[PDB]
Amino acid sequence: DFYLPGDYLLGGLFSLHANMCKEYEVKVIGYNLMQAMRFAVEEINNDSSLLPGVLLGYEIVDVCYISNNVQPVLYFLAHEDNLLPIQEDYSNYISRVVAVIGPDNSESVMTVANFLSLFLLPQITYSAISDELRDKVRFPALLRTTPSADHHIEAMVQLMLHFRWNWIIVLVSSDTYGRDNGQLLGERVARRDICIAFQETLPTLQPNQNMTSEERQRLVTIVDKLQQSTARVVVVFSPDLTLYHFFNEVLRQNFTGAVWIASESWAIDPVLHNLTELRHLGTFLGITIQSVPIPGFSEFREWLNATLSFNTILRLSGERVVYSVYSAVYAVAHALHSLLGCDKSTCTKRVVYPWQLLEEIWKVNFTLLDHQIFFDPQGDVALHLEIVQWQWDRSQNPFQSVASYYPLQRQLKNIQDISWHTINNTIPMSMCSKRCQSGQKKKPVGIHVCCFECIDCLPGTFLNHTEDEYECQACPNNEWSYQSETSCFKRQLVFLEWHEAPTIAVALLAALGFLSTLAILVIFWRHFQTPIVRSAGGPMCFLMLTLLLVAYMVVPVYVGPPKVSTCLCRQALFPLCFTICISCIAVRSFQIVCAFKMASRFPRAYSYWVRYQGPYVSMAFITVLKMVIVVIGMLATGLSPTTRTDPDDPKITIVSCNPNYRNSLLFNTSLDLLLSVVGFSFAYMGKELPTNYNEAKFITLSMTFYFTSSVSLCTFMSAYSGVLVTIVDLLVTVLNLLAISLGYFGPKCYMILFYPERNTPAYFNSMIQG
Amino acid sequence: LCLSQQLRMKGDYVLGGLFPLGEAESRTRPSSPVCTRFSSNGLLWALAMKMAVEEINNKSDLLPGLRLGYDLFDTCSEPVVAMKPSLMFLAKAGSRDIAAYCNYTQYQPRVLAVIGPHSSELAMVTGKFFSFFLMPQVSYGASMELLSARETFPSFFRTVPSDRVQLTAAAELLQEFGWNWVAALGSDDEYGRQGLSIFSALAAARGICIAHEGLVPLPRALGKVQDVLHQVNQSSVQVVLLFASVHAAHALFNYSISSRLSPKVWVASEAWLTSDLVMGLPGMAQMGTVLGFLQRGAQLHEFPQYVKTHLALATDPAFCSALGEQRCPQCDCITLQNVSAGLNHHQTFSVYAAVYSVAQALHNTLQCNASGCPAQDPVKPWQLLENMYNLTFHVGGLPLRFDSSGNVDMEYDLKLWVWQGSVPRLHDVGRFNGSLRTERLKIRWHTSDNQKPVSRCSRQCQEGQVRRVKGFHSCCYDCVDCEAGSYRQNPDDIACTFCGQDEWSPERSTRCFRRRSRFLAWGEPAVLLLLLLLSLALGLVLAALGLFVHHRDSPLVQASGGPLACFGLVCLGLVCLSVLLFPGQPSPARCLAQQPLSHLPLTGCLSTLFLQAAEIFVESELPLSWADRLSGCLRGPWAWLVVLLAMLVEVALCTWYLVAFPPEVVTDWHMLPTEALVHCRTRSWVSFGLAHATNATLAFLCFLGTFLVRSQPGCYNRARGLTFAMLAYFITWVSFVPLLANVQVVLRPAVQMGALLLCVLGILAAFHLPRCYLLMRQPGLN
């Protein structure tokens, strides 16, 4: 069975026993792969259009995993009688065989290639995947009929992208396989916005052996680390014959809930599949190579003890790697057909050096079972991969297709339905941090990008997702916003309006006051002869009345939008009149008492000293202070209108003249209070002992009206009433002036128009002396 | 020269050799590549082996009577060219062919041993081929852990320490100095990958585990190097281990110097700990400490003079003629300067030792004693393998022994970089035989105060914190204690749920506990004092009641009003007794029966005082005709008419305010930490001002009508008391406005209490007391 004479021979290196070569357990995979090779050879012989006349033979040899690797190569490279000449140019060495269908394991493949490179003898492998085998400098005569490992990693990552998984765990074995695959997966994931929770190394072990306590402790710690994290997608890079202990340990605890992404090594294995209790740990997805039915093969295969035992399994599976051997044999056959230059029915024998076949092998192109067999520049043929879910019920196959992968496009396609383990057939969830709500920004936590915290922004700041999502920009301009608001609602200002009832109330209170003074103005004028008018000091009294009309004429500057044009008058014009108004009353009190008190208490000089410097100049000096303090106040401050924020609600704001602050308001109500108190003291001194024309009585009365308004305003302003400061000051402003209009002259209007008891010149002349 | 012709000498037993004699500066035919460029290191090592063989031949104790030989070859550091001589060594003696058999024991090799190559890459390739035939192979430069396995390399020995010992020493240094938080980096060659694979397990088995494990790309004719450093800088690690070849380290340090990186403690390997390239990089002084391990070993002292003499001899025309009686055709035209660069290389000794070992093994297998020894069949190569394990062979007066795995044992020295100017120097501060021995007072660190740099983690978070797991292999924890606003519900589930609304809890709290209702209680120190004053307040008011109702018919009281005075007097006591409703636990009735039931009597009494003041105003200011009319009118029921009018107004105002904004009980929680505050809430001064409107108006109307009346000449006046009484009310309610808004919230109920007690006291000391004082002395006055 392991020999067939022919004009041209082929080599074969399969691992029939792997666990002298005939001392280990049997492996049927080697047997059916060898049968595939033999079937390919016989079929190529049967046809009468591929190679007319030229027959083919084979020479098969066992390898026993990485045990036997040097003897077969020396056997193949030998003319005859087991003698291999050594020289410096093998351009005319006719080796025993023409090509070698390389071994399965990667290490054996490398070992054999490092030997066959000298003679440039083509070697096609069928189950070894490693990026290191794509370097044509080290391996100039090695080809492969299956894809490399980066394609497996790409399929894994595309599966992890289709369903939203960005939080995974990785486990690797302790050997080149696991280390290389894990490093490659990490490099791939780093560029696709996916995270790795941690990584671990499984202790290397074998079934049917006794383990030390340290390794059991290691497994316990690994399973605990698994059953402490939030990641629920585990990717395992390890070969079979090592995972039994790990899975038993995981079963001993109560770890349930995970998606186990396997690799080619244990994606299709019956011995581990048979563990029934494994059913209840989650979904099992693996990456494998697409199967291709081969017509007329089971007849050859069935027509040894281990094969019958798993004949059912070899029917369900096992057709995933035989196509590789089939295609490799047919590729060698086509290359030989091209090299010899044969035709449909004619052939010409000729010496064939092995190094020549490589050139024609590099450029074959044909169709086999509706698959194109051509080699890429790195020595590969692109065959579709598959993702297989593990199904337990024995009715249908134990490995069910769920998707397809196309190497020439790097895309997953034709994704079918999968039966998960969740409650209502939902997609298992794996993520580190939850998505943020509307308006909230991102606060980083840890070294992984995909983990973060959600932070809500405070008022006055808006979060523009189109810009940095880790910090919300402050709302500029007059726009305003509050908690969790990407958009602002720019605010509003207010000032003393018209329809407001308090403004109307002040209007009536001011108006009736203004009318009263005007009626007094005509009355104090057309009666210029009666002593009451002359008893007021003369025209000096008229100057006082007029300045009060202006004051009440200055009520409307307080109503309307606030600006510098009006803010100036509110600061300079309005308070100018007030100080003189009280001063004339104060100096009047000086007249009542001092003019005769000091003229009778200090007649030595007072009689002549005050004779020339009348009270007018004394009042003027009080004024001179008023301008000085005023101009200082304006210079100390500015005329720019002031804006404030309403505590009642952010949407409202307040604009008012600069002295709106009580501290600035008190700036001018200091000398005014001083003038008030000194006048009050003098008036009370001559309350009733003198009866000049009954003026002390009123002066004390109007002074009291001023004081209650002043003390009331300060006390209330010590508590504040929201947006009422403007109105209250105006109400006091109109009220304190009224104390003058109907508290200093109104009664004197009565005497002139009601009682002539003072109008008679004789009567007043009598009271003047007294 | 005639050097190239001295690479083959005959003898009874011949050794084989493989050195990188030459270098070579796309395969279409099966031909061996040709190397031409000359490398001096291979020539130096070959001459070292030649010296060893000559020395062995000269001696008498070793192999007495037998003559050794050698057969050197070139490898070009390429497997393709190194395989051919290897295939030659194992061939039938005196033939040019090799035979394929099922096993060894059927071969007749033309060599006895091979001094293997200097490269691990070629060592792995050639060892597998040799192990089939059991041909002992001794290597002088290969240092890789993967070659210690005896299942794939049965017949491999090396005279250079493996890479496991250096990493073990590094791990022990890290542990002894106390560095749990580190970062491991390695090159992209097999060197770095194997180093990382070993060190990960070594560290994980000692308590050290890494923050990042990365690879540094090789300079194969820059972007990835940026990413690697960013991760390192993002983990706050002051210690970095670099296991890389010279080129990767040079690239990494050039990049680091180009930009700015904070100094860190770099733990090096032997590749770049003694390389002039790295030492000569400008700006290297601004990176920190550099420690490492360097092996201790003797050095051949006669090698330079030996090479001088043999070069001079080769120059002799006569010798070349006799010598005749090409593996390296490019080493025949070299001069002393071409080889003077490395006549102190620290590996000639290794080759020396290698040769000696093989010789000794043969001496033991032949069973030779002192001067002559038995005649037998020639020893086969596979026989020596039994005597090579546990073989004590003396080289340069330094005993050496092979182990089961085939390695030799050597010590180490801990080297530190010190700067004196711009030239680095190597100093010794440690030793490593099997356990590290370190000196700490001879190290100059890179910190400001010359203090040990620190890199540590925490492996157990104290009870009362949430632990966030960090690390590549998930070892260490970052401990955070949530503030005084949440519990620690579970050790896992890293989050601190906020306390319950009723609950109070400090920082580092396992749970949030219940709170306590807060309200001014009846027994508070403030309340008692306010109640003690209440006893005095009631006491004095009643006494005036005991007087006015006693001298009711006296002329003095008659002027006051008699019965009218009493009604005001009794009413004052009631409002005083209305001072107890405030404190204690709020109740809906006491909240709504607090304000309207307190100010109502006051307006019931300020009418009484007003009737008197208006009486004084009738005569003092009004004309006679109106004065008589008012005197005879107000004296009658008009007094009680005004009282009823005031009572009706006050109730109407209270009812309006009651419906407008009825006070209600409210609970405040966040004002104070550990007590939930329940207290009655009002609305600004709207309720206050409305209830204060009547007594404010009537009190003023009394003040203006009696402040100006002239004092009675030489007699008590009825205007002084009212004027002084009314100003007492005004100041009390004016004075407490700033207070009630600027005191503690809880005492807010306790200030409204005072206003009435202070208000009533003044009135009793202004208008009623003077009548009582005179009345008490009335019998004595007259």
Tab-separated table of C-alpha atoms in Angstrom, chain B residues 167-338:
chain	number	residue	atom	x	y	z
B	167	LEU	CA	17.027	37.078	34.169
B	168	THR	CA	16.834	35.249	37.502
B	169	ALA	CA	19.472	37.595	38.923
B	170	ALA	CA	17.567	40.601	37.577
B	171	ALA	CA	14.359	39.351	39.200
B	172	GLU	CA	16.115	38.839	42.534
B	173	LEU	CA	17.603	42.345	42.381
B	174	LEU	CA	14.156	43.783	41.643
B	175	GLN	CA	12.700	41.863	44.588
B	176	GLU	CA	15.459	42.797	47.042
B	177	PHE	CA	15.292	46.512	46.232
B	178	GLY	CA	11.490	46.403	46.533
B	179	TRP	CA	10.101	47.093	43.048
B	180	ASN	CA	6.709	45.479	42.398
B	181	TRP	CA	5.508	47.915	39.706
B	182	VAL	CA	7.713	47.608	36.603
B	183	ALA	CA	7.532	47.582	32.802
B	184	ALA	CA	9.184	44.990	30.556
B	185	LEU	CA	10.361	45.647	26.996
B	186	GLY	CA	12.211	43.428	24.548
B	187	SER	CA	13.491	43.427	20.997
B	188	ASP	CA	11.652	41.949	18.011
B	189	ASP	CA	14.163	39.123	17.490
B	190	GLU	CA	13.919	35.655	19.012
B	191	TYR	CA	16.239	37.117	21.663
B	192	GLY	CA	13.610	39.483	23.041
B	193	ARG	CA	10.635	37.150	22.677
B	194	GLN	CA	12.354	34.342	24.585
B	195	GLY	CA	13.580	36.813	27.199
B	196	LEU	CA	10.062	38.102	27.806
B	197	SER	CA	8.660	34.567	27.899
B	198	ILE	CA	11.139	33.577	30.615
B	199	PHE	CA	10.882	36.782	32.634
B	200	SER	CA	7.076	36.878	32.746
B	201	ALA	CA	6.941	33.550	34.587
B	202	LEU	CA	9.983	34.350	36.728
B	203	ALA	CA	8.393	37.604	37.900
B	204	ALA	CA	4.903	36.170	38.378
B	205	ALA	CA	6.423	33.470	40.608
B	206	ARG	CA	8.052	36.038	42.938
B	207	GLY	CA	5.408	38.734	43.515
B	208	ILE	CA	6.538	41.087	40.745
B	209	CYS	CA	4.201	41.518	37.806
B	210	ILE	CA	4.345	43.971	34.980
B	211	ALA	CA	2.363	47.031	33.933
B	212	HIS	CA	3.149	46.629	30.221
B	213	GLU	CA	4.806	43.952	28.076
B	214	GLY	CA	5.854	45.217	24.653
B	215	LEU	CA	8.242	44.735	21.747
B	216	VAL	CA	10.569	47.377	20.292
B	217	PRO	CA	10.619	47.273	16.460
B	218	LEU	CA	13.974	46.616	14.843
B	219	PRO	CA	15.622	49.261	12.602
B	220	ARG	CA	14.919	47.400	9.355
B	221	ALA	CA	15.102	50.569	7.253
B	222	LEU	CA	9.904	54.616	13.805
B	223	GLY	CA	6.166	55.171	14.116
B	224	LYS	CA	5.571	52.166	16.365
B	225	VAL	CA	8.342	53.303	18.723
B	226	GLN	CA	6.130	56.291	19.542
B	227	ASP	CA	3.261	54.071	20.687
B	228	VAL	CA	5.431	51.879	22.923
B	229	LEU	CA	6.746	54.781	25.000
B	230	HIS	CA	3.307	56.372	25.401
B	231	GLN	CA	2.011	53.301	27.242
B	232	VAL	CA	5.090	53.246	29.489
B	233	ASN	CA	4.665	56.920	30.388
B	234	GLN	CA	0.952	56.297	31.059
B	235	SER	CA	1.509	53.810	33.913
B	236	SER	CA	3.749	55.783	36.326
B	237	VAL	CA	6.642	53.309	36.478
B	238	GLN	CA	10.155	54.337	37.525
B	239	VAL	CA	11.785	51.017	36.513
B	240	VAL	CA	12.107	49.649	32.971
B	241	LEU	CA	13.770	46.407	31.865
B	242	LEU	CA	15.256	46.400	28.352
B	243	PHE	CA	16.156	42.986	26.907
B	244	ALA	CA	17.126	43.877	23.344
B	245	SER	CA	20.015	43.684	20.919
B	246	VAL	CA	22.252	46.701	20.401
B	247	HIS	CA	20.472	48.230	17.401
B	248	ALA	CA	17.010	48.357	18.990
B	249	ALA	CA	18.421	49.894	22.173
B	250	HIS	CA	20.347	52.470	20.135
B	251	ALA	CA	17.219	53.448	18.203
B	252	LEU	CA	15.117	53.642	21.367
B	253	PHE	CA	17.625	55.824	23.210
B	254	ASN	CA	18.188	58.082	20.196
B	255	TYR	CA	14.440	58.665	20.005
B	256	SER	CA	14.187	59.217	23.764
B	257	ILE	CA	16.994	61.792	23.720
B	258	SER	CA	15.551	63.563	20.669
B	259	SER	CA	12.391	64.312	22.650
B	260	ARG	CA	12.194	64.674	26.450
B	261	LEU	CA	11.585	61.692	28.739
B	262	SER	CA	11.790	61.684	32.519
B	263	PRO	CA	14.785	59.735	33.887
B	264	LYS	CA	14.107	56.116	34.803
B	265	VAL	CA	16.068	53.146	36.118
B	266	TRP	CA	16.979	50.991	33.110
B	267	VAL	CA	17.880	47.351	33.750
B	268	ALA	CA	20.014	46.153	30.855
B	269	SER	CA	21.283	42.965	29.266
B	270	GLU	CA	24.817	42.099	28.153
B	271	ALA	CA	24.137	43.174	24.555
B	272	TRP	CA	24.154	46.944	25.166
B	273	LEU	CA	25.636	47.256	28.670
B	274	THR	CA	29.159	47.480	27.190
B	275	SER	CA	28.596	48.907	23.689
B	276	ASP	CA	30.487	52.046	22.697
B	277	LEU	CA	27.627	53.070	20.393
B	278	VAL	CA	25.168	53.578	23.252
B	279	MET	CA	27.780	55.018	25.616
B	280	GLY	CA	28.736	57.628	23.011
B	281	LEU	CA	25.221	58.919	22.332
B	282	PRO	CA	25.071	62.662	23.134
B	283	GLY	CA	22.628	63.530	25.892
B	284	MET	CA	22.608	60.025	27.384
B	285	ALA	CA	23.457	61.486	30.810
B	286	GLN	CA	19.868	62.779	31.175
B	287	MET	CA	18.122	59.383	31.384
B	288	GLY	CA	18.994	58.042	34.844
B	289	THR	CA	20.700	54.992	36.313
B	290	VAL	CA	21.980	52.039	34.283
B	291	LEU	CA	22.619	48.723	36.070
B	292	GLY	CA	23.440	45.321	34.650
B	293	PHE	CA	25.099	41.944	35.094
B	294	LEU	CA	28.444	41.009	33.526
B	295	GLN	CA	29.980	37.554	33.751
B	296	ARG	CA	33.327	36.868	35.420
B	297	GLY	CA	35.911	34.814	33.576
B	298	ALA	CA	39.613	34.517	32.972
B	299	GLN	CA	41.234	35.832	29.800
B	300	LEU	CA	44.057	34.247	27.831
B	301	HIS	CA	47.281	36.164	28.450
B	302	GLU	CA	49.549	34.684	25.746
B	303	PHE	CA	47.122	35.052	22.823
B	304	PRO	CA	48.457	38.419	21.539
B	305	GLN	CA	52.122	37.399	21.460
B	306	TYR	CA	51.110	34.048	19.969
B	307	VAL	CA	49.278	35.709	17.082
B	308	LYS	CA	52.172	38.129	16.539
B	309	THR	CA	54.659	35.263	16.339
B	310	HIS	CA	52.492	33.167	14.027
B	311	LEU	CA	51.797	36.084	11.673
B	312	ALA	CA	55.533	36.775	11.513
B	313	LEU	CA	56.200	33.087	10.844
B	314	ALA	CA	53.594	33.056	8.071
B	315	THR	CA	55.445	36.007	6.544
B	316	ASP	CA	58.471	33.700	6.183
B	317	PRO	CA	58.923	32.496	2.574
B	318	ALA	CA	60.680	29.358	3.825
B	319	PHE	CA	57.778	28.238	6.019
B	320	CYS	CA	55.235	28.407	3.192
B	321	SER	CA	57.412	26.041	1.153
B	322	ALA	CA	57.664	23.580	4.046
B	323	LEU	CA	54.010	24.139	4.965
B	324	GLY	CA	52.928	22.884	1.544
B	325	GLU	CA	54.938	19.687	1.996
B	326	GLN	CA	40.646	27.192	0.130
B	327	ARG	CA	37.921	27.707	2.727
B	328	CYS	CA	39.009	31.330	3.310
B	329	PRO	CA	41.013	32.584	0.309
B	330	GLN	CA	40.489	36.177	1.515
B	331	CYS	CA	42.505	35.977	4.766
B	332	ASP	CA	45.885	35.556	3.023
B	333	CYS	CA	46.316	39.314	2.406
B	334	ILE	CA	45.683	40.759	5.874
B	335	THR	CA	47.974	42.778	8.139
B	336	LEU	CA	48.395	43.297	11.866
B	337	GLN	CA	46.070	46.314	11.901
B	338	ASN	CA	43.267	44.241	10.360
